[PDB]
Ligand binder design. Structure first.
Ligand SMILES: [Cl-]
Ligand SMILES: [Mg+2]
Lengths: 9, 196
């Protein structure tokens, strides 16, 4: 599956 | 005064927040908002969210350059699935840093403009606008479909917090007319809310 990108701010 | 139409163009520009260095960005302009033509929706290379910036007015933007590069037109791999997925609730599987499975409830909103094989999607627990080539996920079994004006108006979103957020409704989702996009003044994300 796609990896979720790190949250920004 | 004078501006070229940059919808569908590749752009690059610098971005400066506060007292930090200028950082460099490359992206694709997806749309120019009819109820606020100063506002563009942009997909940046390698970042999943769709952003809203007033590219020609925002002092944080510098060195804005419109490239001659032409985005390629592909025909989507399955037109039926593409069309029927729009407006649907979905379970979208991701995996995280440790490599474990992580399923997010979402709603497919529309085909993206410009980038023909991409789709607008938002999530129950993260209700901003995202864009992905969702047919790839569907083929891998990582996207499952669940069984099942205000535009241009200034609005505010009140909290128990006491403060509120002010913004404008910028779009009504064709496939699901109770759902709208909102641009808040303090924030470059595009928020998605069911307003009925
Ligand atoms: Cl969820
Ligand atoms: Mg769940």
């Amino acid at each position: 599956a796609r990896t979720k990108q790190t949250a920004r701010k | 005064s004078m501006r070229r139409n940059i919808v569908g163009c590749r752009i690059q520009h610098g971005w400066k927040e506060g007292n930090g260095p200028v950082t460099q960005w490359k992206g694709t302009v997806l749309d120019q908002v009819p109820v606020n033509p100063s506002l563009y929706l942009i997909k940046y290379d390698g970042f999943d969210c769709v952003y809203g910036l007033e590219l020609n007015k925002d002092e944080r933007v510098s060195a804005l350059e419109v490239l001659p590069d032409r985005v390629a037109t592909s025909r989507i791999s399955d037109a039926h699935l593409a069309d029927t997925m729009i407006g649907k609730a979905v379970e979208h599987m991701f995996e995280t840093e440790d490599g474990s499975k992580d399923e997010w409830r979402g709603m497919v909103l529309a085909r993206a403009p410009v980038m023909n094989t991409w789709f607008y999607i938002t999530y129950e627990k993260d209700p901003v606008l995202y864009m992905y080539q969702l047919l790839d996920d569907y083929k891998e079994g990582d996207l499952r479909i669940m069984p099942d004006s205000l535009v241009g108006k200034q609005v505010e979103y009140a909290k128990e917090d006491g403060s509120k957020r002010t913004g404008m409704v910028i779009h009504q989702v064709e496939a699901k007319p109770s759902v709208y996009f909102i641009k808040f003044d303090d924030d470059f994300h595009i928020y998605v809310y069911d307003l009925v």
